[PDB]
Ligand binder design. Structure first.
Ligand code: PTY
Ligand code: PTY
Ligand code: FE
Ligand code: FE
Lengths: 319, 319
């Protein structure tokens, strides 16, 4: 049995739509119809999409089998998605779309910190961590210290900003990739102080794979691409009056830096960690075993919300 | 909990991939990587796809919310697909892609019969119907007679071709849209005779809606488009040595002819049914109530398989 469908009530259009006598007329008629779309933003998106879609098909002479393979692929991508897995985001990520959209929507005007992709490992349950405390238990990897200031593009400190941070442990796992999730690990939620300063202890993150077991994984193998991300520390900074910044810093030295499978890496976000070999200083910062630590010293420069919106709308006129 | 992912074993590429310092470099790097795709057809498809995708994003300055809406839409489309519902095909259909691909892959060489979309109502269980017999029980709608000849493009009759035909009843339902499907209705499987001739009784099909209750239905309403198909009779003709023809004929007089929601209609496939007001002839053809019938007289011209393939690859030279 199959459902009886129901007419949606839209009338036959009063437009000149000649019966297609060649493949081009399909496109022409569809584009004519698209002009009936009443929201002009929707109309623009629809028109531009259709043109690209039809041009793609014409340029490639897509075959029946290739079209059907595409259909089945897109279907399987949707069907593997769950509240804990977003294969369509992963497809957007690996095809560079996520990163391109992210850039366009968060233009780094006036020397702002650049954004980078969020990925799937953010949790809204990270513990509160005071400045100087650790997001990582002892034994989760090599010591790293992170510090800087949250500032406006004009240089003014931003107090009370919320800084969410998360990363892998030394094995390349986020805390929710373990069976025993008794307590959060390698993540924290901080607040910039009254001078906009923040500091915390952490571990040196490591490279890791994105999901290669579903359709996106199959695609990467046909493209002879890897499914790896280089090491990074995630940060998300929010503060009323500013454009929320979702970003990451990528330590130098990782062989995947130039070929991030999701195009998170940006030049300004690759950081050279400083080796601090000063046992006294290490212990004073609260590293329990002292010795030495890698230092990641970086400010987080936020764009006032009105400036971000203005930049985006002004740049969208060019394009 | 989330799965540990696994590296796919592809190495970091030895390519010059500068860390993006502007959004354009995302695209440049992705296109460079794409050259590692080993199958040159895949490489071509991937490259063309990526360029269109990235151009679409740049031209529109797609917003974060629009991107996320798209993601969620595509997800829902996949998730509603089942063995009995293909919402991705419906999306391809309503955006004209299915019809465009179908045309390109079944070029009407030497004025052969043009193809048209299959839709979802084909069944491989249709009963055998002898020439002159009916695919429709009495009381399923207005009488129609269908006849013609199956031929090669050189004019040679094609004997023993298998002709699958199906259609709605006068209420606009296919047989599998009813609770009681004890037996097939308004469908049949014929064989062309030794002179390539076929003939059968049927009913005049009627306009009907495609599924409007899923994501594609929501999209059509935002585009101020209807979800209707004009009246049509489906045919699928197969014969060893020839390109299988999936087509449909669309009776004149239907207000949706110019605006088929899935772009099945083609100029050559619109047919003017002849009103035969001849009680005697109606009875002689086996119409039980006599009176009158509409006549659909159309030949089915098949392309020899080698010719179809040649035409397609020659046309792909242009593009
Ligand atoms: C907007 C204008 C531009 C759009 C125009 C076209 C969109 C629809 C048509 C898709 C065309 C398909 C051809 C692309 C091929 C690329 C990869 C080729 C290699 C390959 O074999 O990949 C298989 C299928 O991948 C695939 O099927 C990849 C499909 C990619 C889908 C298109 C983009 C998805 C959306 C991205 C994010 C959405 C954000 C919203 C803006 C993987 O399968 P396999 O190798 O295991 O087996 C089948 C192999 N013979
Ligand atoms: C070869 C295989 C082929 C497979 C088929 C091709 C696949 C191509 C991709 C199709 C994506 C279309 C998704 C649009 C969903 C819109 C409908 C959602 C439901 C709903 O009621 O949403 C409304 C949106 O309608 C609207 O937005 C109506 C306007 C429709 C515009 C369509 C273009 C939008 C951007 C899509 C980019 C995808 C990249 C290419 C793969 C309100 O929500 P809203 O108003 O906020 O929605 C704006 C963001 N779209
Ligand atoms: Fe990550
Ligand atoms: Fe139909």
């Amino acid at each position: 049995e199959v459902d009886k469908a129901v007419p949606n009530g839209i009338p036959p259009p009063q437009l000149d739509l000649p019966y297609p006598d060649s493949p081009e007329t399909i496109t022409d008629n569809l584009l004519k119809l698209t002009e009936l779309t009443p929201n002009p933003r929707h109309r623009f998106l629809a028109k531009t999409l259709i043109t690209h879609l039809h041009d793609f098909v014409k340029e490639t002479s897509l075959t029946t089998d290739e079209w059907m393979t595409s259909i089945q692929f897109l279907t399987r991508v949707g069907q593997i998605c769950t509240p804990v897995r977003q294969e369509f985001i992963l497809l957007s990520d690996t095809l560079g779309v996520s990163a391109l959209v992210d850039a366009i929507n968060n233009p780094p005007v006036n020397g702002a910190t650049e954004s980078s992709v969020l990925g799937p490992f953010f949790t809204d349950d990270a513990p509160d961590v005071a400045n100087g405390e650790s997001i990582a238990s002892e034994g989760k990897g090599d010591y790293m210290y992170v510090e800087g200031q949250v500032l406006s593009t004009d240089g003014t400190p931003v107090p009370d900003a919320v800084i969410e941070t998360w990363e892998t442990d030394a094995k390349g796992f986020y805390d929710n990739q373990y069976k025993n999730r008794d307590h959060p690990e390698c993540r924290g939620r901080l607040r910039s102080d009254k001078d906009g300063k923040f500091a915390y202890r952490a571990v040196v993150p490591v490279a890791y794979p994105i999901p290669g077991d579903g359709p996106v994984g199959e695609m990467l193998l046909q493209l002879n691409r890897h499914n790896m991300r280089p090491n990074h520390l995630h940060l998300m900074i929010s503060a009323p009056g500013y454009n929320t910044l979702v970003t990451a810093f990528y330590p130098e030295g990782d062989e995947y830096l130039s070929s991030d499978a999701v195009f998170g890496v940006k030049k300004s976000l690759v950081v050279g960690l400083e080796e601090v070999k000063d046992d006294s200083e290490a212990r004073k910062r609260g590293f329990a075993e002292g010795g030495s630590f890698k230092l990641l010293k970086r400010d987080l420069v936020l764009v006032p919300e009105a400036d971000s919106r203005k930049a985006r709308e002004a740049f969208a006129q060019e394009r």
